[PDB]
């Protein structure tokens, strides 16, 4: 009775959930509409929780996909997953509107599609036992996915004031400005909704994706097009306490609750270790769990742009270390015994910090059911280095002249730009204030 | 610190972290032996010794008498 | 049940889990609904945790229940600030 | 956990450490990726002792390469072991440089690249469990190693006072005066820091290098490529009490404490028997171990030029004879019986001397487990000849009027030339006083 509606929205947001649903059929090792193995019921002991159980010989995703370009969801039609999705229940196959790229297009298109947008997620729940919440799988990139998704961060926490908000924000490439040039604008507007019309967030930086894709997966050709591959893997990693049982924090609101000290701090750095390829020529003789959490208390997996002298001028405040699947679960507490002797952990220079370890099984699926898997869902105070990157690329755009008038072509016709600036410096500073 | 009953626990975790950052040549041997430091000289030095088990019937060659002759 | 907690069914570790429950009712009843009464509720919690630290230290013997090792993680946390 | 950072500096200082890292990979049997030999852990009981401490089975040289000459370092990144090297904590890939070839070039470039030269040894001391020290693999040839090497002889004496200092001072052929002529000036500025701001040096001269290169490797016309094998072997050779456990003077500051009578006398002569291919024919049945230190009882293999007739006007004080690999050690106590009887090494007459004998285990790699080896680390007081030799080349250079105003256009503008003369004569008196 913990049914979650994913609200995949945007050009990238539809892609990271396109490969999320595709990851589940391949890790349970079955057909996305059949059963051809017994690992489906034996591995996954709660087969429906983001699906519903069979009554037509087909699996039913709890997904909605709206965007302002009809091209991305027809690139879900083209692919043969039309017997895992429904192009009249699970998506609107050709939904138009804006060009778009303006944030202000989609923010005004949620308010004239206001009647229809809450009868498609509340029609997506209609045999549900009871709702957990909503995951807004939306994109910050472009103004389309960012534009309508930022309206739903408000209306879903007061039409349902007891349900979960948590966002998979994915930024556009910060090594470009020629992909989207309204990028400092559409980022910060949503960041106002991230601190006071939210609860917890997941912010994912794109240049740290390509930092890892050439250093842990070693492809020669760093491009903006590995954006969805590293993300869809950490999305399916985050919910191994809801699609396979837990023990304590046996809900998803269990993990997420203990990683929020105060509102405005809850920006979680995500790490996921099994991307190494030198841990796989040594999987016959079983790789060790004694040095795989010296990658969660030392950088080797951050998808958050953070400095190198900001892992010492800021410490962990809350750190969660989720071990998954086969792992040798009888020495994971021996591994956490030798952390304190070296001091690889970082704690605030005042009061309590906490290194939480928890464990959970998985279905047959060798990179995390035959190899040690380490997920970090960290909470570091070093998150202002990004908020300085977004503020410093935002005011830099106003000395270039752009989107002081080219943003006010639809909706916005009043000044509120130094209002998004002022709230952002309030955010960056109280965090530093909160510790000694 | 001249030997006392709490110095015993200190020397056990101390051999623990010391031999572990060097990497003891076998990882499962580390927690099946440790050093053990009870009358006091004035210093723990030259007042500490070894505790290690023995198996069937290897002990008749390694009887509990001659482990003292080596420890002294 | 030795591995669970045990507490020898008598020892102040059993008194601190009883007592931190008594503040937990004050935390849910004030937040569901007094700001000086909030901060008192966790000043008693800080009394109860600092009471716990001195108990870990008198339980420390040389090896004595698998909770003891895991407790000395947090002790060295306390040392770190 | 006894990690040493080699500091290659200078034109000749980069060529001698290049084959040093190449000797280590070949004897540990490892690939530049992973393990391919289980002699890697059974033979070397401390793989990490100059390498990065693995956490995904990778080993990284702890090397830094700064130099004003890009010709010598461009032959290091076009190697099969250029992947053992990483240009991201070592050096840049295609690195730059100063003028160079002047002592004032590299001394002033030492202090405006002051941030990165002390933030590249602390990006190689972050897994460290305590640093042993620093080995300054610097040249005495040209102004490049000597300018930049005089800087780090100072700051590691006071930002790092605890840590061990020891240098491989390599001279060029001192009779050059047309490709280098500024060699007695750049030498003495570095020789002054070496005796007062450094504790130990390992001296090496070139005229005794080519002495081996024509009678142990046998060229008809000299080359400087038969000079870099001789240094790179003696580099891995000193660390057989530390890369593989000792017992006593198992620390490297243990060997050196018994090799230094007191600073003012610390210049260790180096000697090495297996450089020739006629010492593998004296280990097919094992030749006796009585004779492997009675060839070091009076040297005939020294990489330091000296007379054999200057052994009867001088007296050895400390001599170390480290034997390596299988030598069948049980007639080694017989070998010290026969030392006093010949006396080809005079012992000091104010008090007793020291005949140090060592043995060491090494990997089962063929030239480290078969050939009979004598590694000499002598400390003989006939070294005053080398200091009289560089000072005779200075005083002749000042009467040709050269570098009286030609070297004092850059970072010299005050007298310091007779300070170099006086400090050489106090060092020279105190070497000879310790056998007086």
UniProtKB/Swiss-Prot annotation, chains A, D:
**Which UniProt key words apply to this protein?**
Cytoplasm, Cytoskeleton, GTP-binding, Microtubule, Nucleotide-binding
- What residue ranges are annotated as transmembrane? none
Question: Which domain of life does the UniProt lineage start with?
Answer: Eukaryota
Instruction: Tell me where in or outside the cell this protein is found.
Output: Cytoplasm, Cytoskeleton, Microtubule organizing center, Centrosome; Cytoplasm, Cytoskeleton, Spindle
The answer to whether UniProt assigns keyword Secreted to this entry is no
> Quick check: keyword Transmembrane helix in the entry?
no
Cited SMART domains = Tubulin, Tubulin_C
Gene Ontology cellular component list: centrosome; cytoplasm; gamma-tubulin complex; gamma-tubulin ring complex; mitotic spindle microtubule; nucleus; polar microtubule; spindle
Residues that, per the record, bind GTP? 141-147
- Tell me which InterPro entries the record gives: Gamma_tubulin, Tub_FtsZ_C, Tubulin, Tubulin/FtsZ-like_C, Tubulin/FtsZ_2-layer-sand-dom, Tubulin/FtsZ_GTPase_sf, Tubulin_C, Tubulin_CS
Major localisation: cytoplasm
Q: A Gene Ontology biological process annotation?
A: mitotic spindle organization
What GO annotations for molecular function exist for this entry?
A: GTP binding; microtubule nucleator activity; tubulin binding
**One Pfam family, short name:** Tubulin
Question: Of which family is this protein a member?
Answer: Belongs to the tubulin family.
Q: What does this protein do?
A: Tubulin is the major constituent of microtubules. The gamma chain is found at microtubule organizing centers (MTOC) such as the spindle poles or the centrosome, suggesting that it is involved in the minus-end nucleation of microtubule assembly.
Q: What is the protein name given in its UniProt record?
A: Tubulin gamma-1 chain
Species of provenance: Xenopus laevis (African clawed frog)
